[PDB]
């Protein structure tokens, strides 16, 4: 009864090793959730947006490693809000294998704040709420040390922030959170 979509930051600043670390993390997260009724989908975002696999694609090939392996980093700027809209509209759509009456979960992993985005969070968040999309955020690195950067995460995520926001020091620290998130992807 769960439909998990990943919105992964593939912007320039993420070094190749750290991108593969994030790829490996997503992979691991899917392996650990081998429940016949859990479907996964992935979109990469920067200034460009790419669907790597739909819920339909995943159902027809449930191997997480085979799906994650070919993903190549987009590079460029950060347009988080547009990504969220494109997830809600494209990934969570019946044509792409999205199951109605199944829990809508979005996991956002980002290394920095959105900038130069045509859309704002006020243009995307209410629609995601309306569609019943529970969203989790993993803020990676030093970009999320300020108070204004932290509120961005709290905006991105579902209320309360204490139950939906993660923050890690670096991409190597993603291995360290592989537990408490599994204990958040249940129903």
């Amino acid at each position: 009864d769960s439909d998990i979509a990943f919105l992964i930051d593939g912007s320039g600043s993420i070094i190749p090793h750290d991108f593969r670390r994030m790829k490996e993390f997503v992979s691991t997260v899917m392996e650990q959730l081998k429940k016949s009724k859990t479907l996964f989908s992935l979109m990469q975002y920067s200034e460009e947006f790419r669907i790597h696999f739909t819920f339909k694609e995943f159902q027809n090939n449930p191997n997480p490693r085979s799906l994650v392996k070919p993903i190549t980093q987009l590079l460029g700027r950060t347009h988080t809000a547009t990504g969220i809209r494109k997830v809600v509209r494209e990934l969570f759509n019946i044509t792409n294998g999205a199951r109605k009456n199944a829990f809508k979960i979005l996991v956002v992993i980002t290394d920095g704040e959105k900038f130069g985005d045509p859309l704002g969070y006020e243009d995307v968040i209410p629609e995601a709420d309306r569609e019943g999309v529970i969203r989790y955020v993993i803020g990676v690195g030093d970009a999320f040390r300020s108070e204004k950067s932290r509120q961005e995460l709290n905006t991105i995520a579902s209320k309360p922030p204490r139950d939906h926001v993660f923050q890690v020091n670096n991409f190597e620290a993603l291995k360290t959170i592989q537990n408490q998130l599994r204990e958040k992807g249940f129903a």
Partner: antibody
């Protein structure tokens, strides 16, 4: 030893189409964002748009929507600009420029082509 | 669209003088996450293509002499030539590369005063 080589000067009739090319003789197009910039005689620089030749994803200035089409051919390591339904307003110098990927969220335009003259006259 | 407002449009220069050029954007160009200003300066010599001179508002591109100095943050930016050489007579354009559409300033033409 690393430069952007552009196609020759063009003379075209109004309402026609024209296709300009840009070939980097020093690096691979997949590794950059290829940009096109318009420069009318005595006017500044006007950004047309850019392409990610790695996935063929483009962005344009809405002013150029319809008029310009940016394409790339990784095989021949060439980026193209197509201008359609030409008017005298299209008579300018066209530069291709590259934005390298250097480990930051974006970058400036580090390499520029020599320019391609495009004249539109009946 | 972000508006790049360059001042002055033309500038009377003598060799060895210290010149300044202004570039002001309608929007902030400092990205919080990397603490970098998404501003570049280009030099376009007569009948030549533009050339990247300064990026990140203050970083000199390889080959650029120390006489050229970029300063500023957020909105107000300055290009400074300490001791102008004759080879420096050109049009200087500023560009924002923070968001799309990428926008250029009107340019500052340096001319020799007499």
């Amino acid at each position: 030893q690393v430069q952007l080589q552009q196609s020759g000067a063009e003379l075209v009739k109004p309402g026609a189409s024209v296709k300009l090319s840009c070939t980097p003789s020093g690096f691979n197009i997949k590794d950059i964002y290829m940009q096109w910039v318009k420069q009318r005689p005595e006017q500044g620089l006007e950004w047309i748009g850019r392409i990610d030749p790695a996935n063929d994803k483009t962005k344009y200035d809405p002013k150029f929507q319809g008029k310009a089409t940016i394409t790339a051919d990784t095989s021949s390591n060439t980026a193209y600009l197509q201008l359609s339904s030409l008017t005298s307003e299209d008579t300018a110098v066209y530069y291709c420029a590259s934005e390298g990927h250097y480990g930051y969220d974006g970058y400036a335009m580090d390499y520029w082509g020599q320019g391609t003259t495009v004249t539109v006259s009946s | 669209d972000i508006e790049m407002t360059q001042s002055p449009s033309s500038l009377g220069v003598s060799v060895g003088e210290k010149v300044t050029m202004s570039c002001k954007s309608s929007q902030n160009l400092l990205y919080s996450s990397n603490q970098k200003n998404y501003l570049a300066w280009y030099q376009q010599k007569p009948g030549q293509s533009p050339k990247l001179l300064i990026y990140w508002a203050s970083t000199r591109e390889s080959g650029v002499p120390d006489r050229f100095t970029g300063t500023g943050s957020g909105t107000d930016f300055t290009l400074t030539i300490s001791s102008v050489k004759a080879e420096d007579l050109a049009v200087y354009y500023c560009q924002q590369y923070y968001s799309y559409p990428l926008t250029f300033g009107a340019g500052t033409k340096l001319e020799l005063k007499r």
